[PDB]
């Protein structure tokens, strides 16, 4: 069946790991501690088709990762995550996108912009601002909470559909 290589990127603390674990966790382990970069597998049916998702949870740009360029080459679609209470993380999206362009040599790489931590009242990035940004790149914008689980499935499955539509 169809395998998708997905990569989760973004600034430190935005919830890259929390999102990934929320999607892929089977709850055998009650609380799972993800301190390192790692890969995780999830089998899912999307629009009638059984997909195997291979999901790479990455470190922020400021962290050293030897395989960084290679996993961006491998990656077929990217969740570009910022937190709605962290303006710097939203501003850093430009840099994550540029890194993906640098490696893959394309302006048309499948991506979804994800405003995480939407359960929090203390918002500093308005949804309209992020919609405008996503529209300028021709990518979807999805808000999520890794805590309440709102939007998590939508974010990842939307990314899969972007990859499929890119073909
Ligand atoms: N309120 C709230 N907190 C969240 C949400 N997602 C993650 N967090 C919290 O934000 C902190 C960072 O989460 P984490 O999953 O480690 O983020 P990360 O982007 O993987 N961090 P790192 O870059 O260090 O790997 C944790 O305290 C986590 O519980 C969310 O949707 N809502
Ligand atoms: Mg993490
Ligand atoms: Mg406000």
From Swiss-Prot:
SUPFAM superfamilies: P-loop containing nucleoside triphosphate hydrolases (SSF52540). Changing residue 89 to C: Found in a patient with severe fetal hydrops and pleural effusion; uncertain significance; decreased activation of Ras protein signal transduction. A motif (Effector region) lies at residues 32-40. Glycans are attached at residue 35. Changing residue 32 to F: Loss of interaction and recruitment to plasma membrane of PLCE1. Widely expressed. Changing residue 13 to R: In SFM; somatic mutation; shows constitutive activation of the MAPK and PI3K-AKT signaling pathways. This is GTPase HRas. The lineage of its organism: Eukaryota, Metazoa, Chordata, Craniata, Vertebrata.
């Amino acid at each position: 069946m169809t395998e998708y290589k997905l990569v989760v990127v973004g600034a430190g603390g935005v919830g890259k790991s929390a999102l990934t674990i929320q999607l892929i966790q089977n709850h055998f382990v009650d609380e799972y501690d993800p301190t390192i970069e790692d890969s995780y597998r999830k089998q899912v049916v999307i629009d009638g088709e059984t997909c195997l998702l291979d999901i790479l949870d990455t470190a922020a740009q400021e962290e050293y990762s030897a395989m960084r360029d290679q996993y961006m080459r491998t990656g077929e679609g990217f969740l570009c995550v910022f937190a709605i209470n962290n303006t710097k993380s939203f501003e850093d999206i430009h840099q994550y996108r540029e890194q993906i362009k640098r490696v893959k040599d394309s302006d048309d790489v499948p991506m979804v912009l994800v405003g995480n931590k939407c359960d929090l009242a203390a918002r500093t990035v308005e949804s309209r601002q992020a919609q405008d940004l996503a529209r300028s790149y021709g990518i979807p914008y999805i808000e999520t909470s890794a805590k309440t689980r709102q939007g998590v499935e939508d974010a990842f499955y939307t990314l899969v559909r972007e990859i499929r539509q890119h073909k």
